[PDB]
Swiss-Prot record, chain A:
Entry-annotated residues carrying Phosphoserine: 51
Cellular localisation: Cytoplasm
Position(s), cross-link Glycyl lysine isopeptide (Lys-Gly) (interchain with G-Cter in ubiquitin): 30, 42
Designated name of the protein: Small ribosomal subunit protein uS3
Mod. after translation: Ubiquitinated at Lys-42 in response to stalled ribosomes. Ubiquitination leads to activation of the No-Go Decay (NGD) pathway and degradation of non-functional 18S rRNA: first monoubiquitinated at Lys-42 by MAG2, followed by formation of 'Lys-63'-linked polyubiquitin chains on monoubiquitin by HEL2 and RSP5.
Quaternary structure and partners: Component of the small ribosomal subunit (SSU). Mature yeast ribosomes consist of a small (40S) and a large (60S) subunit. The 40S small subunit contains 1 molecule of ribosomal RNA (18S rRNA) and 33 different proteins (encoded by 57 genes). The large 60S subunit contains 3 rRNA molecules (25S, 5.8S and 5S rRNA) and 46 different proteins (encoded by 81 genes).
Miscellaneous comment as given in the Swiss-Prot or TrEMBL entry: Present with 146000 molecules/cell in log phase SD medium.
Job of this protein: Component of the ribosome, a large ribonucleoprotein complex responsible for the synthesis of proteins in the cell. The small ribosomal subunit (SSU) binds messenger RNAs (mRNAs) and translates the encoded message by selecting cognate aminoacyl-transfer RNA (tRNA) molecules. The large subunit (LSU) contains the ribosomal catalytic site termed the peptidyl transferase center (PTC), which catalyzes the formation of peptide bonds, thereby polymerizing the amino acids delivered by tRNAs into a polypeptide chain.
Cystine pairs: none
Family: Belongs to the universal ribosomal protein uS3 family.
Swiss-Prot record, chain B:
Reported function: Component of the ribosome, a large ribonucleoprotein complex responsible for the synthesis of proteins in the cell. The small ribosomal subunit (SSU) binds messenger RNAs (mRNAs) and translates the encoded message by selecting cognate aminoacyl-transfer RNA (tRNA) molecules. The large subunit (LSU) contains the ribosomal catalytic site termed the peptidyl transferase center (PTC), which catalyzes the formation of peptide bonds, thereby polymerizing the amino acids delivered by tRNAs into a polypeptide chain.
Protein name per Swiss-Prot or TrEMBL: Small ribosomal subunit protein eS17A
PANTHER family referenced in this protein's UniProt entry, alphabetically: 40S RIBOSOMAL PROTEIN S17
Listed transmembrane segments: none
GO biological process, one term: ribosomal small subunit assembly
Note: Present with 30900 molecules/cell in log phase SD medium.
Keywords: Cytoplasm, Ribonucleoprotein, Ribosomal protein
Family, similarity comment: Belongs to the eukaryotic ribosomal protein eS17 family.
Subcellular location: Cytoplasm
Pfam families found in the cross-reference section: Ribosomal_S17e
From Swiss-Prot, chain C:
Location (main, coarse): cytoplasm
Covalent cross-link Glycyl lysine isopeptide (Lys-Gly) (interchain with G-Cter in ubiquitin) as placed by the record, residue numbers: 44, 51, 105, 135, 159
Role summary: Component of the ribosome, a large ribonucleoprotein complex responsible for the synthesis of proteins in the cell. The small ribosomal subunit (SSU) binds messenger RNAs (mRNAs) and translates the encoded message by selecting cognate aminoacyl-transfer RNA (tRNA) molecules. The large subunit (LSU) contains the ribosomal catalytic site termed the peptidyl transferase center (PTC), which catalyzes the formation of peptide bonds, thereby polymerizing the amino acids delivered by tRNAs into a polypeptide chain.
WD repeat ranges, renumbered to this chain: 13-53, 61-100, 103-143, 145-189, 192-231, 233-273, 282-317
Note: Present with 333112 molecules/cell in log phase SD medium.
Organism the protein comes from: Saccharomyces cerevisiae (strain ATCC 204508 / S288c) (Baker's yeast)
Disruption phenotype: Defective activation of the ribosome quality control (RQC) pathway.
Subcellular location: Cytoplasm
Descriptive protein name: Small ribosomal subunit protein RACK1
Example of a GO MF term: protein kinase C binding
RNA sequence: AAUAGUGGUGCUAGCAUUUGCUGGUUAUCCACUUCUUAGAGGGACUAUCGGUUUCAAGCCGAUGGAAGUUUGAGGCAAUAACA
């Protein structure tokens, strides 16, 4: 990626560097290495009285 | 030469708050657990995160937490006899069934006019 | 009068924690022992009250913790289930294993062998159950849980092989399921444990099923009526279980010692609690695996500091 | 795994010789991966016990362990007058 000027104003060797958002990557990693995410777990059955069943 | 950064410190007590009955004082088991309940990007970061939770978890077997803990909700509700005495410390039976008061405070009860089994002593100064 | 258990020996051949000991019904002179330290150790029961002699073989074939070992009645072969998705078919003489397995995605947690020596069941931590041939071929996968699994047991078919084999499992979703082999189907759903189920063993008659988890909830089950007769509260954490083969004594391996019960009535005979040295008292070692004799006259107990102690079942005086 | 290597079967020379210890090379052929190279994974977290400290963050010993000085060494990271 090395692209020069089509501007009326300002000429010298202009350079651009590009490091996009990671939430839509689809090629390799998807989050920064500091990121951690734990999942919710679901609400519980109360006490589970025995009620054993014999199939 | 080795203290743990807050991103280890913070997430170690988030994991202990959502899955506390699932955890275990042995490190080798719950090494296999954090990948299931959470997303860890690297591998060495998982090894450090599960390292200090187990070190945090044996504090629970001696003292209380800086998160939440349902031993407050149940075993401190078993602390409803921290010591309940079988006879009260506020029992007049310890005072031979008669209350020992100062002189002029007896006029307070006589002002509101009640019939209490009290005794009166002498005061200095 | 009663079964007192005095100290008869001590074994020192490991540097992990033991995970499963194993006795032979035929041969009463050896002991198979597995441990966390990637080793398999077969013993020699030199009857002596100073020590027991020889760990006659070692088996260097794995890469991580092994979980449970099983063998034949006479002591012909041996199996192993290590954490790296591996299963090995060992001999008992040389050390030469036969064939490794490619069948799972996790720790292979528990295996068992039929006495007809045809199928090998396997339950692994990736919430699936698999059966294997003697040459080691896939037959059918089995699903149904959603958490992990800890132990799987084949029923003792002592009814002269009347086409009655069934598999009972110790999951991790507070669930105990029963799985047929001849028809490959769920048989009975056992409900009542409120936490992580830790261990289960059935009676040596194959009749009375005991189950106990993390909270210490010893919930007894039957083979056919399959009901909650006894729901014992062990008020601790129990790791593994123990059934006397000849008598009617059921025992449990808690973290706070070793507790024993009779079937009927309820006799707390002894607390097998060994002795240590040099500890701040939040650090007492404890056992995780235990085993009986072939005649129920000796009991083994491996501990976290690699000590395996033995007792003898003599009468009380 | 003839673009690495050993293990034999040979043709083959020594051989103290007498069983033997050194050779022999294209293709004598077969069987092997430990050493070798490169992909896929695993493994260490200060682990486990003993001290010490507001009993806290941690720091010192200990035995295990291929590895316990951020495990050893680097790469990468913007406030500013050298017109």
């Amino acid at each position: 990626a090395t692209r020069h000027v089509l501007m009326r104003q300002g000429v010298l060797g202009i350079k651009v560097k590009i490091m996009r958002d990671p939430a839509k990557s689809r090629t390799g990693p998807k989050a920064l290495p500091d990121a951690v995410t734990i999942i919710e777990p679901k609400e519980e059955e109360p006490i589970l009285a025995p009620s054993v069943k014999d199939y | 030469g080795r203290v743990r950064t807050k991103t280890v410190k913070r997430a170690s007590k988030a994991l202990i708050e959502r899955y506390y009955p699932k955890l275990t004082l042995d490190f080798q088991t719950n090494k296999r657990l954090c990948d299931e309940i959470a997303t860890i990007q690297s591998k060495r970061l998982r090894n450090k995160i599960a390292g200090y939770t187990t070190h945090l978890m044996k504090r629970i077997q001696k003292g209380p937490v800086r998160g939440i803990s349902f031993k407050l909700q149940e075993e401190e509700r078993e602390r409803k006899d921290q010591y309940v005495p079988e006879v009260s410390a506020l029992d007049l039976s310890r005072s031979n069934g008669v209350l020992n008061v100062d002189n002029q405070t007896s006029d307070l009860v006589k002002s509101l006019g009640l019939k209490l089994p009290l005794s009166v002593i002498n005061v200095s100064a | 009068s009663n079964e007192v258990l005095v100290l008869r020996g001590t074994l020192e051949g490991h540097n992990g924690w033991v995970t499963s000991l194993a006795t032979s019904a035929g041969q009463p002179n050896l002991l198979l022992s597995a441990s966390r330290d990637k080793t398999l150790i077969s013993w020699k029961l030199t009857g002596d009250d100073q020590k027991f002699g020889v760990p006659v073989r070692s088996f260097k074939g794995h890469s991580h913790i092994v979980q449970d070992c099983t063998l034949t009645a006479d002591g012909a072969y041996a199996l192993s289930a290590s954490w790296d998705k591996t299963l090995r078919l060992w001999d008992v003489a040389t050390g030469e294993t036969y064939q490794r397995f490619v069948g799972h995605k996790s720790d292979v947690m528990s295996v068992d062998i039929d006495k007809k020596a045809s199928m090998i069941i396997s339950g692994s931590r990736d919430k699936t159950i698999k059966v294997w041939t003697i040459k080691g071929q896939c037959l059918a996968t089995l699903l149904g849980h959603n958490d992990w699994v800890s132990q799987v047991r084949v029923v003792p078919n002592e009814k002269a092989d009347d086409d009655s084999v069934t598999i009972i499992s110790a999951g991790n979703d507070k669930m105990v399921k029963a799985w047929n082999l001849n028809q490959f189907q769920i048989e009975a759903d056992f409900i009542g444990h409120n936490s992580n189920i830790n261990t289960l063993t059935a009676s040596p008659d194959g009749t009375l099923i005991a189950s106990a988890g993390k909270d210490g909830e010893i919930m007894l089950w039957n083979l056919a009526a399959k009901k909650a007769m006894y729901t014992l509260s062990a008020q601790d954490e129990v790791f593994s279980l123990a059934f006397s083969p000849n008598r009617y004594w059921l025992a449990a391996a808690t973290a706070t010692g070793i507790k024993v019960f009779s079937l009927d009535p309820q006799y707390l005979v002894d607390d097998l609690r060994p002795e240590f040295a040099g500890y701040s008292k939040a650090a007492e070692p404890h056992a995780v695996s235990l085993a009986w004799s072939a005649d129920g006259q000796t009991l083994f107990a491996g501990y976290t500091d690699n000590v395996i102690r033995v007792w003898q079942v003599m009468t009380a005086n």
